[PDB]
Amino acid sequence: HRIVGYYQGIRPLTNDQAKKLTHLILAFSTPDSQGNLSPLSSVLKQALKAGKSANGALKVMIAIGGGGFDPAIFTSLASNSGTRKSFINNIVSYLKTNELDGCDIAWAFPTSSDKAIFVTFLRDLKKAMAPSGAVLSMASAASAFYLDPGYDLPGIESAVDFINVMCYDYYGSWTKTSTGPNSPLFKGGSADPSDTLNSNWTMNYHLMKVYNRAKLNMGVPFYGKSWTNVGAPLNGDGLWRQLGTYGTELAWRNMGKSFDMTKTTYHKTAKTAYIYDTATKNFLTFDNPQSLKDKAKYVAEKGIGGIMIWSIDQDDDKLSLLNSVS
Ligand SMILES: *[C@@H]1O[C@H](CO)[C@@H](O[C@@H]2O[C@H](CO)[C@@H](O)[C@H](O)[C@H]2NC(C)=O)[C@H](O)[C@H]1NC(C)=O
Secondary structure (H helix, E strand, O other), X not given: OEEEEEEOOOOOOOHHHHHOOOEEEEEEEOEOOOOOEOOOOHHHHHHHHHHHHHOOOOEEEEEEEOOOOOHHHHHHHHHOHHHHHHHHHHHHHHHHHOOOOEEEEEOOOOOHHHHHHHHHHHHHHHHHHHHHOOEEEEEEOOOHHHHHHHOOHHHHHOOXXXXXXXXXXXXXXXXXXXXXXXXXXXXXXXXXXXXXXXHHHHHHHHHHHOOOHHHEEEEEEOEEEEEEOOOOEOOOOOOOEOOOEEEEEEEHHHHOOOOOHHHXXXXXXXXXXXXXXXXXXXXXXXXXXXXXXXXXXXXHHHOOOEEEEEOHHHOOOOOHHHHHHO
């Protein structure tokens, strides 16, 4: 039921976008070493106003932290009962001052020594947010490598209104073995070297640990990733190919300008889109309307509570991706 859209300030939020979301999560505000939150940027403030103007039911939240934020500052703030209290008071004050409806904790990543203190922090934060009805969420990781040591999912669930499960970045600049899909729905059959680098594995991990799956959102990306000088398939499937050189992460809106989308291969087992261009040896893994349709159907079939998007401003001007989710 939920459509949770993260927003980075790549371009203005449009009135059509705001009407397709239940929650808009502005990214990011960061705490300093002492727990003061960074001021809301102009581009994020503009999107807050645009969103509420176009959709009076929309909940606009601030994501605190981020993939590019030192997680040791979260450890320090949350571990000390005194600084935990003042940080939480600062967050609640920040929501009031900036006319926000809630916040998303984006801690990348909690370690084994953070597991219990993260739960205490979220529980205490919800208590402070409850009188105003402010919405609390957090972003969850996608592999057991991070999930097992750092995430007490039952405890997190008991504190938050929903969990935004980040089912993407399964392959990237760190991958040394081959190309692969940024965000497949499933394992891709017998040629797939991995059982776990897919959204279905990640969501099943969460489903086995949480009490109520309605509190989960399955995350989907509106971006893809490129490699260059890519060679032959490893074991007969063109999704996993001999590595050349990592390229970059590309927003959907910028893909068609640089890749020939008529050469898209849709992997029928993994449910993922890629392009291998035999002329240039460029490789692109991405999500497209078909993969998002398959993902929305999966969410409905499994009874998962919603879909999360990173990030809605990466969509094209005609909202090809958001309209396929919608
Ligand atoms: C999605 O993931 C689930 C969970 O891993 C897969 O279901 C398992 O499938 C294996 C192989 O058939 C069985 O050993 C388990 O009994 C299944 N567990 C559950 C809870 O169903 C499922 O196959 C995956 N879906 C796809 C399309 O790959």
